Amino acid sequence: KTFTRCSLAREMYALGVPKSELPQWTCIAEHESSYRTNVVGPTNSNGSNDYGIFQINNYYWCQPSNGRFSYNECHLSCDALLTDNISNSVTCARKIKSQQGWTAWSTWKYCSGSLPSINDCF
Template sequence: MKVYIVVGALAVLASLVAPGLARTMDRCSLANEMSNLGVPRDQLARWTCIAERESSYRTHVVGPANTDGSHDHGIFQLNDRYWCQARGRRSSNLCGLSCDTVRTDDITNAVRCAQRVLSIQGWTAWSVWRFCSGDLPSIDPCF
């Protein structure tokens, strides 16, 4: 019975993601869009590493439940307990956004919120930071 519940829950979750709201980026497309949004170029390799590790560059991802019942959203996996407001959940909503807005093709809100996380908690806010803290491949070939 539990298998059906899990499969059913996944089917419902998949149905909530409209085809037009699901995009998988790549390292260079993300770097270029972030650069166009004013993100400093010296941060782009780190951001692309985080996005690759957190969401495989997918804008629409909702992560599995964390131990506190919260979920992580979008390309940078922003937590709905602190950073964005998910429907029916309590949140500090420090970015002042609906979690739906960080899971769209337009990554502007996700980028702005991720920058806020960085300004408050630093790079270590992301659990994947250990993979993204050393020397990374240059982002220059993307430009």
């Protein structure tokens, strides 16, 4: 359904995301999806749609079920990114960050500075 900052931070930590990244990840989730896992974004200017808690793009990262071309760099259906279990979204998001950096997210501009410590989540 909907995470909170700390529930998301805890789960992402459990899935191997370092704490030193969590404020950024949760800030991004908050902006992208308001921590909702099942959201498909409004269609973008290029006709693409973004999926899930991190609003991961269906032209680059996941394969639309409709078979429309995607680079599918995360190697999963976009529907895999809408599941209650965030593991797929996390693994994909980490890949996106590895390859493209935080600036892959348009909302990074809001999350690139001072952020609250995540320690209160732990």
